[PDB]
Write a new protein. Structure first.
Lengths: 92, 87, 1217, 92, 87, 92, 87
């Protein structure tokens, strides 16, 4: 089958950082770039779920969402591991 | 592998008929919240109940799968979508 | 990498020009190494300029850490305050404010600073130890500098020898992955002490009076008085009269102002910094263009920009030097203020085309220094005797005026062999050395223009000017000369992608008669200058600059030009550039408009095709059609009444003091003649009383898209433009920009707005400055409902149904009232949420601070429930603020409770603050309310009585209700009353309105209860993080009294330190200022305890009376600003140790920590990056203030922003929610 | 078979509102968002034709094109039925 | 089905060889008007006659199919494209 | 086989102007539109290489990159032949 | 044909294991320079060496093929990638 499924199964329970390919998003008048952080909680043949999830905003670099999120496999651009996003990273 | 991924997404959406969900898209009007009803091909019919503008409420919409960015579907024993009430 | 520096502060004499003008009390920064050399050179040359004496500039790479060691050698404590950098205020603030430890250094001491740089750009630093505005100040004497940050991995060398350098003004930059380019710096400064060789102040030789103060660039300036004095000796050319040889290098040689050198096609970047204290300047650059904001590629195309004290910008010319077609020659750089230009604030830019090894010489014998070429481009060919290159092939002569260009004038001179070898293979008139039209075969258009002189009538009262001059087309000369047509400025329209040919002729007398305003001027020649287009600078400039030819025309001659327009461009400005100060005030200027391709032009009345005018209709096959209208604003109108008595003459003839008369398109409509029978100012704008004005009026049907072009042909003053009932986008190409309803305009600027008419009625446009309104600069926009016979219908639009409309006629009585409850605003839907409010107005005294300053004639708005509390004296009144959410419907109930006997001036004459042309104007009792950026019917909720609209005002014992709808997230909106501008605006009748996102809730920051008013609340959202909000309102022009009840006179009595001498000031510079009915004048603190550098410390004096804000580290913060002021002088806003996006919606905009050119009606919202405390969350105290050292900071416009470090029982944290 | 073909055949002759995926378009210096309103007139296995059609421009919310337009099936993001084009809808 | 849609679009374009057409694309130079000549794979060749800038006119161009937003093809008995000439 | 391969083999060693489809690119804080010109040097069944290559920058429409570049076939929007980019062309 | 192109791209990248490359993408952080180590499906392995920010260095990254815009791989007898040295 798809080796990526086994890879994400092996990497269960660790904090990772993901970026999608969309230019920007809007949420009731708030605009930001698609960068996410959190712990991987559940993986599926087509998508993965993160909870809790932190969204990096320019003026709110530590805002915490109240609900989990899911991301399709085909929408992932770049990602890495062994990053604790409670630390400071550049956002510009 | 694209066909397999699309099939997985379609099965996941099909198993959720009759539930509440939230959808975020990069295109206008950027957000839909409501009850999923059924799907046609690679398109999903949603009975929208809360969205960006009041004039675009209480009707049906059709969304292509390829423009879905993030989503969440309610499950039993799972955290509830916040009670977004117009006050 | 870690960088280090060593900086010393010294005092020494400064020389500004070769004539010997000097300042004996200069204070500048300098590096440690160069101190001895600079002192020795200063000693050796008592009265000669030295290049080493200049503002300090240093460079560093992005992401580095900088350590600076400072040593002081002055006569007082001093420090260095930075900008746009991350640091801890506990060790590197540069001042003693709040509870922070002192960071300044006494003389002879040392200190260390640490900074981190994260964003590229410009870092401007100055001193705050001494803040006096007199000659004893620090920054006023030239104590400032800047630090420049380059991109990652860059390097810099010398422009001449290529060796390493540490500090300087000219440099070159190399990068591995990016192109190399040259760098330049440009500093503006004014108001410095100046002495001549005799130690006396300069005097104006024509008038024998005092000359204006210093206005120079990089501690240099070139007054014309010295050159005229040299001329009067009879040594240089005797036939040259006053100005035509002012910039000609063939007579005097190169000046001492900065000169920029480079080759063709080299990319360049210019850094612009304003270090002045008082005035606002405009920067203009010939034959070049740049983008509005370098960060985004969707901005507009500009060629000039305004600037304010303590602000900076970046400039990147398109296609490099020489523009698209690669022109060569001399290009001038100057400010556009004509008095300032006469003072000599100008520079020159030089472009070569051949290699310069340093072995060549100028025609006067001066050796030319070498110039290292860039390493990644092909080198220019070496010079040869047959092709010496610029400027050695020009057949000029030293000591005489430059010769005419060849093939320009009919029957002109012939070409020489040098020009033949240097010019292109196929020269044609108007294009000798560079062909601008790309050697293609585009459309060709021809024109014929001449200038005349013929008296003009302004208004019905007979105000007229016998000596007026303007441009006219050749064909219509006979009709206009016979009086059959009405004179007006010249505007013509062409589509894009056109090669333009023009023939120009002069039909002017060579002698200008003298008068009480101006002396006798001999204008025997004139030229033609143009903006925004490509052309040959050598033979099409219209002036005489540097070593170039002279391109002017004597009367009775003819010259031809050629220009190219390659893409869509907005309105462009053209005027004369030789005798501007002589007769530009008389109205010699015009503009042209470039329309989208394949467009058509039709007359708005008959539909016949035309090519010139100010009001036409544009038809296009594909894009929507619209209607176009152009406006011109100008001042310094020399007017005489019907009896010939001069109006507002200056103190002495020839003075540059403003007589003070404005006008629009040779029209005006003063308010003093529109009183009516009842003598009630509330009905000033009603056409039912005195009829429609003579100012331009726009006519259109409902739903017709419109476009407006805005330009200024005035002399020196700034203005603000507002429109009631409409709105438009900021950046047309970029849909992510914000939405505005007001624009600030400087001289020679251009703008364009687009919108549509939502409903029938009448709309008002005016310049909202107090004197501007009082002098009558306003007009109307009219929208019909039926089909008139004298108004054509656009092709793609649908014809409206007919209807019998009886046009109202003036009757001299007020109209009937309206019933707003009968209809709904457009866009609203039935079933929306409803909000309600109650508003009352009254009079009450206001306390300003703890030292007794107060105003006994205050008028404020307030909620109905709060009247009894404020009337008992148990509360201090505050401005009114309202909040609402998107999609809500707002209903407001209004009531008035004014009385007559409480007004101080019943005759309407105000001795202080004064305005020109006072007259009888009794105050009124009725009142209304107006807002902006909201949807409402203009016929029922505009808050004004304009045109034929019904009444919208309430007297005593009456009640009205408005209806407003919110349709978008706009942020902050301004509110004020327009019932009586001369008796209500100044005393504090205004408010603010805020629109927030959906599903938002407001809470009191102390008791956590529901809040409805206030400037410090908490916003909670289900899907968004919690945030704190702060509100600020700025105003000025207030009248105050002391504790003993004596009148106070600002800024005369607020000068620190206490001195008895100070010159005269402008009329509109009087009055006090402050924030939110509060102010903290420093004179009291100075008198109580005279220490200069400890004025801001609250440990000695206490907290100020201005609003105080508190927060915890990491908490998001949003701030909002408004300025419903009255005066004209602009202001700036700045905050310590923070920065924000220029546009909150467009995430690709630039980053800055200031706001510029704030005037009446300005609105903005700010979101801080990283929350409180910056990225690193450093606790401490921070200051917010203005940027004008002169007359602003000393008057008490500043506050304290406090970030706590330990939890306080009275300030709950955001964690609990 | 393609279900959308039958669906659009069933919904022939009625108004419709269609939004594409592109961020912004440009026509001779005029920029706008890709929003369309009009009637369906012709259906093809790969595209459809609209006539008359209206383009929602911010400064001209009722500008109508002089020629019919065609859109491919793969470039459609959202759409809805039974909405009159003459009604005024929020734009900003 | 995606290949079916691509084949349908290709056949529709092929049937219109020799006619006039208009194409709008989101990328520079944003607009083409001309006559179809011949087709290569998933790429179509157009002899443009008028575009945004005159300096890029009177030459050949190639367009990838997947980046076309809207288009129109002239047919006998149908409304004609307006005569867009530069005067 | 693939006609594009044969066509690009036929057009070996000539000038060409190429534009991709991405909205904009960023390099160390420098933003520009994706326009390239230069010679063609090598062809693969999936990509082609240009050497030397020129990038149309607003401040420098004649900047020469110091290394060759490769473009995938599927990332092509518009192109044309027999045009020398040393000529001056409007860009905005 | 599309799968053929993808296979060709994957083979070209696979033959370049152990070589220094440069990749430019429209999405943040917009640039990567380093060495190829592994290959997983349609995702590449790069040990980064130099990028936009120095704080994001000396670690491992994953890149999807579809988002690659331009690229280059060095080979013996070819110009070397310039070294962005922090002086």
């Amino acid at each position: 089958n798809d080796p990526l499924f086994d890879f994400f199964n092996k990497h269960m329970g660790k904090q990772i950082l993901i970026i999608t390919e969309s230019s920007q998003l809007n949420i009731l008048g708030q605009t930001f770039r698609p960068i996410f952080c959190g712990k991987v909680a559940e993986v599926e043949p087509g998508h993965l779920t993160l909870s809790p999830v932190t969204i990096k905003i320019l003026n709110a670099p530590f805002h915490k969402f109240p609900i989990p999120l899911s991301i399709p496999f085909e929408k992932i651009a770049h990602f890495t591991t062994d990053v604790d996003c409670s630390m400071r990273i550049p956002l510009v | 592998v694209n066909e397999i991924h699309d099939s997985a997404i379609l099965e996941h959406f099909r198993n959720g008929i009759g539930h509440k969900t939230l959808v975020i898209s990069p295109s206008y009007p950027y957000m839909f919240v409501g009850i999923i009803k059924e799907l046609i091909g690679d398109t999903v019919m949603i009975d929208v109940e809360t969205t960006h503008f009041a004039q675009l409420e209480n009707r049906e919409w059709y969304i292509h799968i390829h423009n879905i960015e993030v989503f969440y579907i309610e499950r039993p024993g799972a955290p509830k979508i916040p009670k977004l009430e117009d006050y | 990498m870690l960088r280090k520096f060593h900086v010393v502060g010294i005092s020494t004499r400064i020389v500004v020009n070769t004539f010997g003008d000097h300042n004996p009390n200069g204070r500048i920064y300098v590096l440690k190494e160069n101190e001895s050399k600079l002192k020795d050179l200063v000693r050796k040359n008592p009265y000669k300029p030295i290049d080493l004496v200049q503002p300090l500039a240093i460079r560093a790479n992005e992401g580095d850490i900088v350590e600076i060691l400072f040593e002081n050698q002055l006569s007082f404590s001093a420090g260095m305050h930075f900008q746009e950098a991350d640091y801890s205020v506990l060790s590197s603030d540069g001042a003693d404010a709040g509870y922070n430890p002192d960071t300044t250094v006494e003389p002879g001491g040392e200190i260390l600073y640490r900074l981190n740089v994260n964003q590229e750009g410009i870092c401007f630093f100055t001193d705050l130890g001494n803040v006096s505005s007199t000659e004893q100040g620090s920054s006023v004497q030239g104590l400032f500098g800047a630090l420049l940050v380059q991109k990652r991995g860059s390097s810099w060398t010398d422009p001449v020898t290529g060796g390493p350098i540490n500090s300087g003004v000219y440099a070159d930059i190399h990068h591995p992955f990016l192109p190399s380019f040259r760098e330049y710096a440009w500093f503006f400064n004014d108001e410095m002490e100046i002495r001549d060789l005799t130690g006396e102040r300069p005097l104006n030789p024509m008038t024998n009076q005092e000359a204006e103060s210093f206005h120079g660039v990089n501690l240099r300036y070139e007054p014309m008085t010295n050159r005229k004095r040299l001329m009067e000796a009879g040594v240089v050319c005797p036939d040259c009269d006053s100005e035509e040889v002012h910039h000609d290098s063939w007579v005097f040689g190169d000046p001492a102002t900065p000169i920029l050198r480079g080759y063709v096609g080299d990319p360049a970047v210019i850094r612009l910094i304003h270090g002045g204290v008082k005035e606002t300047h405009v920067f203009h650059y010939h034959v070049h263009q740049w983008l509005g904001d370098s960060s985004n590629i969707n901005a507009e195309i500009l060629d000039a920009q305004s600037i304010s004290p303590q602000t900076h910008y970046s400039i990147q010319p398109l296609y490099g030097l020489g523009s698209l077609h690669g022109a060569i020659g001399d290009s001038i750089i100057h400010c556009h203020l004509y008095p300032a230009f006469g003072i000599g604030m100008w520079g020159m830019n030089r472009v070569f085309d051949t290699l310069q090894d340093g072995s060549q010489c100028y025609p006067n014998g001066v050796r030319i220094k070498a110039l290292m070429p860039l390493p990644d481009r092909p080198e220019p060919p070496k010079p040869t005797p047959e092709k010496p290159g610029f400027p050695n092939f020009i057949p000029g002569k030293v000591g005489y005026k430059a010769p005419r260009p060849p093939l320009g004038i009919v029957g002109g001179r012939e070409m020489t062999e040098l020009e033949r070898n240097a010019a292109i293979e196929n020269p044609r008139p108007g294009a000798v050395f560079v062909d601008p039209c790309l050697d293609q075969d585009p459309v060709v258009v021809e024109f014929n223009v001449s200038a005349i002189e013929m008296p003009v009538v302004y208004n019905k009262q007979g105000w007229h000017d016998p000596k007026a001059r303007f441009y006219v087309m050749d064909e219509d000369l006979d009709d206009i000369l016979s009086g059959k047509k009405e004179p007006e400025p010249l505007v013509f329209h062409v589509p894009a992608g056109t090669c333009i040919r023009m023939n120009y002729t002069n039909r002017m007398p060579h002698i200008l008669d003298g008068d009480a305003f101006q002396l006798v001027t001999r204008t025997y020649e004139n030229g033609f200058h143009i903006h925004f287009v490509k052309f040959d600078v050598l033979a099409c400039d219209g002036g005489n600059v540097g070593w170039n030819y002279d391109s002017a025309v004597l009367p009775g001659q003819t010259i031809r030009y050629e220009w190219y327009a390659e893409t869509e461009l907005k309105a462009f400005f053209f005027h004369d550039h030789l005798f501007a100060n002589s007769h530009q005030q008389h109205g010699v200027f015009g503009a042209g408009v470039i329309q989208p391709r394949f467009s058509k032009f039709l007359d708005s009345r008959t539909g016949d095709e035309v090519d010139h005018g100010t009001q036409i209709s544009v038809e296009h096959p594909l894009i929507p059609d619209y209607r176009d209208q152009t406006l011109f604003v100008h001042d310094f109108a020399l007017l005489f009444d019907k009896n010939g008595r001069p109006i507002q003459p200056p103190e002495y003839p020839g003075s540059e003091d403003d007589p003070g008369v404005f006008g629009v398109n040779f029209k005006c409509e003063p308010l003093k003649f529109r009183l009516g029978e009842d003598c009630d100012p509330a009905y000033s704008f009603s056409s039912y009383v005195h009829g429609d004005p003579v100012t331009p009026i726009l006519r259109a049907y409902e739903g017709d898209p419109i476009r407006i072009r805005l330009l200024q042909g005035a002399h020196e003053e700034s203005h603000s433009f507002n429109i009631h009932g409409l709105r438009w986008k900021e950046e047309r190409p970029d849909l992510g920009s914000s939405m505005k309803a007001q624009q600030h305009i400087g001289i020679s600027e251009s703008f364009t707005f687009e919108t549509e008419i939502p409903a029938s009625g009448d709309y008002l446009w005016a310049f909202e400055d107090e004197e501007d309104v009082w002098l009558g600069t306003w007009g109307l926009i009219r929208a019909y409902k039926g089909r008139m016979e004298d108004l054509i219908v656009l092709t793609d639009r649908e014809a409206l149904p007919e209807g019998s409309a009886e046009t109202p006629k003036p009757t001299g009585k007020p109209p009937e009232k309206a019933n707003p409850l009968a209809s709904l605003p457009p866009g609203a839907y039935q079933g929306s949420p409803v909000k309600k409010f109650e508003v009352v107005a009254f009079q009450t005294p206001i306390q300003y601070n703890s030292y007794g300053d107060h105003d006994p004639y205050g008028i404020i708005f307030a909620l109905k429930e709060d009247v009894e509390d404020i009337l008992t004296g148990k509360k201090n009144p505050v401005p009114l603020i309202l909040r609402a959410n998107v999609g809500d419907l707002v209903e407001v109930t209004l009531t008035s409770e004014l009385k007559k006997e409480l007004f101080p001036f019943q005759d309407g004459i105000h001795p202080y603050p004064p305005v020109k042309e006072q007259s009888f104007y009794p105050p009124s009792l009725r009142i209304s309310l107006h807002t902006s950026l909201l949807n409402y019917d203009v016929k029922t909720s505009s808050g004004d009585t304009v045109g034929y609209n019904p009444d919208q005002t309430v007297g005593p014992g009456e009640t009205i209700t408005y209806r407003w709808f919110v349709d978008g997230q706009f942020g902050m909106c301004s509110m004020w009353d327009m019932a009586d501008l001369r008796n209500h605006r100044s005393f504090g009748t205004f408010g603010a309105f805020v629109a927030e996102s959906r599903f938002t809730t407001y809470l009191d920051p102390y008791s956590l209860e529901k809040a409805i008013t206030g400037e410090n609340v908490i916003l909670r959202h289900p899907l968004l993080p919690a945030t704190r909000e702060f509100v600020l309102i700025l105003h000025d022009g207030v009248r105050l009294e002391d504790k003993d009840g004596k009148v106070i006179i600002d800024p005369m009595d607020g000068v620190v330190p206490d001195t008895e001498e100070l010159e005269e000031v402008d009329t509109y510079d009087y009055g006090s200022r402050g924030f939110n009915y509060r102010s903290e004048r420093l004179i009291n603190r100075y008198k109580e305890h005279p220490v200069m550098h400890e004025l801001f410390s609250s440990e000695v004096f206490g907290d100020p009376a201005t609003p105080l804000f508190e927060a915890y580290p990491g908490e998001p913060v949003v701030m909002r600003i408004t300025t419903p002021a009255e005066r004209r002088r602009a202001h700036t806003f700045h905050l310590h140790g923070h920065y924000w996006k220029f546009d909150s919606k467009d995430l690709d905009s630039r980053i800055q920590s200031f706001l510029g050119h704030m005037v009446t009606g300005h609105t903005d919202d700010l979101r801080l990056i990283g929350g409180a405390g910056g990225v690193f969350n450093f606790p401490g105290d921070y200051l917010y203030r203005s940027g004008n050292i002169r007359w602003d900071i000393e008057l008490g416009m500043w506050g304290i922003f406090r970030v706590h470090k330990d939890s306080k029982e009275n300030l709950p944290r955001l964690e609990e929610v």
